[PDB]
Design an enzyme around this catalytic site. Sequence first.
Site, PDB file in Angstrom:
ATOM      1  N   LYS A  83      -0.798   6.577  -3.292  1.00 22.96           N
ATOM      2  CA  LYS A  83      -1.834   5.541  -3.419  1.00 22.96           C
ATOM      3  C   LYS A  83      -2.974   5.853  -2.423  1.00 22.96           C
ATOM      4  O   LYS A  83      -2.747   6.562  -1.430  1.00 22.96           O
ATOM      5  CB  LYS A  83      -1.236   4.145  -3.189  1.00 22.96           C
ATOM      6  N   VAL A  84      -4.190   5.359  -2.708  1.00 19.85           N
ATOM      7  CA  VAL A  84      -5.356   5.523  -1.806  1.00 19.85           C
ATOM      8  C   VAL A  84      -6.069   4.193  -1.535  1.00 19.85           C
ATOM      9  O   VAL A  84      -6.273   3.383  -2.456  1.00 19.85           O
ATOM     10  CB  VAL A  84      -6.353   6.543  -2.352  1.00 19.85           C
ATOM     11  CG1 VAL A  84      -7.547   6.649  -1.444  1.00 19.85           C
ATOM     12  CG2 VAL A  84      -5.680   7.881  -2.480  1.00 19.85           C
ATOM     13  N   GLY A 105      -4.664   8.546  -6.931  1.00 21.04           N
ATOM     14  CA  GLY A 105      -4.391   9.981  -7.099  1.00 21.04           C
ATOM     15  C   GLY A 105      -2.891  10.258  -7.123  1.00 21.04           C
ATOM     16  O   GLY A 105      -2.166   9.814  -6.230  1.00 21.04           O
ATOM     17  N   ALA A 106      -2.428  11.009  -8.131  1.00 19.43           N
ATOM     18  CA  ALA A 106      -0.983  11.108  -8.461  1.00 19.43           C
ATOM     19  C   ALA A 106      -0.061  11.712  -7.370  1.00 19.43           C
ATOM     20  O   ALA A 106       1.145  11.835  -7.606  1.00 19.43           O
ATOM     21  CB  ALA A 106      -0.789  11.842  -9.821  1.00 19.43           C
ATOM     22  N   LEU A 138      -8.087   1.664  -3.683  1.00 17.68           N
ATOM     23  CA  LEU A 138      -9.314   2.246  -4.237  1.00 17.68           C
ATOM     24  C   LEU A 138      -9.041   2.962  -5.581  1.00 17.68           C
ATOM     25  O   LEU A 138      -9.336   2.432  -6.667  1.00 17.68           O
ATOM     26  CB  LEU A 138      -9.995   3.169  -3.209  1.00 17.68           C
ATOM     27  CG  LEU A 138     -11.138   2.536  -2.409  1.00 17.68           C
ATOM     28  N   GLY A 139      -8.473   4.162  -5.494  1.00 18.68           N
ATOM     29  CA  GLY A 139      -8.063   4.920  -6.664  1.00 18.68           C
ATOM     30  C   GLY A 139      -6.551   4.963  -6.690  1.00 18.68           C
ATOM     31  O   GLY A 139      -5.887   4.083  -6.131  1.00 18.68           O
ATOM     32  N   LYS A 158      -5.759   8.284   2.320  1.00 25.76           N
ATOM     33  CA  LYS A 158      -4.703   8.893   1.504  1.00 25.76           C
ATOM     34  C   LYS A 158      -3.358   8.786   2.255  1.00 25.76           C
ATOM     35  O   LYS A 158      -3.198   9.346   3.341  1.00 25.76           O
ATOM     36  CB  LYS A 158      -5.016  10.370   1.211  1.00 25.76           C
ATOM     37  CG  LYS A 158      -6.252  10.618   0.358  1.00 25.76           C
ATOM     38  N   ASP A 161     -11.340  22.419  -7.860  1.00 25.21           N
ATOM     39  CA  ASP A 161     -11.109  21.205  -8.666  1.00 25.21           C
ATOM     40  C   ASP A 161     -12.370  20.373  -8.745  1.00 25.21           C
ATOM     41  O   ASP A 161     -12.342  19.152  -8.591  1.00 25.21           O
ATOM     42  CB  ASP A 161      -9.944  20.380  -8.123  1.00 25.21           C
ATOM     43  CG  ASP A 161      -9.507  19.279  -9.075  1.00 25.21           C
ATOM     44  OD1 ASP A 161      -9.472  19.501 -10.308  1.00 25.21           O
ATOM     45  OD2 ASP A 161      -9.210  18.173  -8.582  1.00 25.21           O
TER      46      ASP A 161
END
EC number: 2.7.11.1
Lengths: 288, 288
Positions: B27-28, B23-24, B20-21, B43, B135
Amino acid sequence: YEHVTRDLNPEDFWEIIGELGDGAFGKVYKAQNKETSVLAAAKVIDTKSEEELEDYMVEIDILASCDHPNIVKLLDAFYYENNLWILIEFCAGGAVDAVMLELERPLTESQIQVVCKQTLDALNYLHDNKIIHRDLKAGNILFTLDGDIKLADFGVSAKNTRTIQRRDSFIGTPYWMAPEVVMCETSKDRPYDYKADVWSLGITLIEMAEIEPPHHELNPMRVLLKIAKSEPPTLAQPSRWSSNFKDFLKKCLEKNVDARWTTSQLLQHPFVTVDSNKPIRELIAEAK
Amino acid sequence: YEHVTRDLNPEDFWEIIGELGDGAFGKVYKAQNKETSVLAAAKVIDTKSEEELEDYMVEIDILASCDHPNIVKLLDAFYYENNLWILIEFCAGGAVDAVMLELERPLTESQIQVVCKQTLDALNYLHDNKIIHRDLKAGNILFTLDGDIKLADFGVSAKNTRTIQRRDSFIGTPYWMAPEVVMCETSKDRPYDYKADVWSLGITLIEMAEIEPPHHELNPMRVLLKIAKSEPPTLAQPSRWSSNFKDFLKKCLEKNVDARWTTSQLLQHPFVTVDSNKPIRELIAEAK
């Protein structure tokens, strides 16, 4: 954890010579190192489970991590058969209030001066290091053989060093950050919360002046409501005390938290400018 | 812990259908329940050790404990072979910024209105429940199939519920307590820290109005310094937007933290008084 000893009986290291106080978590003992013969205050805390050890790890972390001449040092800690042993350096003189009871009188103003400067040095370190004592009072200010004082009981203390390093931590460009965050003006960096301790120092001073703290005579149920209702307390027989004493109190005992002085400001006061503990060496010699 | 599953392979429950994305932290993945077929955001966080699980237990605790229609819900968590799996409810539409990129334009003011009221409901719950998102931004505001929005990523969120119940706890008569403590006016009860989020909401609104947030054009190294230096940002082409939009921003984008409005105050604003998500159902239908 970093500072607790799993698997060793602490009565193979430390022998109980007597009982000392009786803090309502458990019993507390005169301890002596079997090898070095160094004396220590032994807190034995009963713990139902092991998840319960997290409950005490802030006292332990505070003591282990503090290094100041006027703050008690952690000597040793043990988890063994559902007790935590905390072994704190042993201040020979007794607790400041325990002395007023033994002598049946309060401290004189010069004796209050030494405690107040020594105790203030303690606090200032704590606040520079992001710890709030949160239970300051005569009974947790302790007296050494040498007529110095060490501040103790960090049972309900707060240490913001890990949550500041948690909060501060970010990645990526922070376009969305508030300006107060950006200028390190979160509540953790700001003095507001730490100033609870200054007010208390105030009450501890009156406690030491009059033996017992303001509102000591009321139903305990009314004490909180009285602290809300009433102006900040003052010395009962004001004519007994110097104008420095009285001024100092006004800077601690101030409800507008902003107005109230920091410890840093307070160290500059003429009340605390002393450099000889003779007054104490005398008080403690008379209680022996 | 309360909400993590030791000893079970999560790919025996949940099948990966895609990425999907990214995020650092790791992986997601697009995940789907092998039994129910409910979709989920997976996540997968690598963790060197087990002491590292404490690092993530606030996201988990926040999600597990939150129950609001506009905050993503925790479906499932697993510790298995040095990864934490966090399975969050899957918002079908995409992230609000991911849409502006797909469409190559910003949201219109009516689309901004719906997100702002929905996102504000989220925040208000959080703040009533002592959580600070910390955030907030377009990319962590997500869109459902139905044209609603759910707020996500609680990776750096703070939850003061345990430290308030820690602080509040005392025994014996408390003669030494500061008056601010006594009146429940510690920094944990007070709105100051929670208001970081309101400022961000402000920037998120401009982000959604202009595609990208203020200072997007500068060297990233200058962004923080610019936030300090400059007055609060405003809309670039002000004539495009209503006076309610512009007024709302003035109440979020305010450097005197006191002046700046709470969420509670903000819900009463004429900008956020909407009750139909048609504007969104349209935007998301055009991105399909």
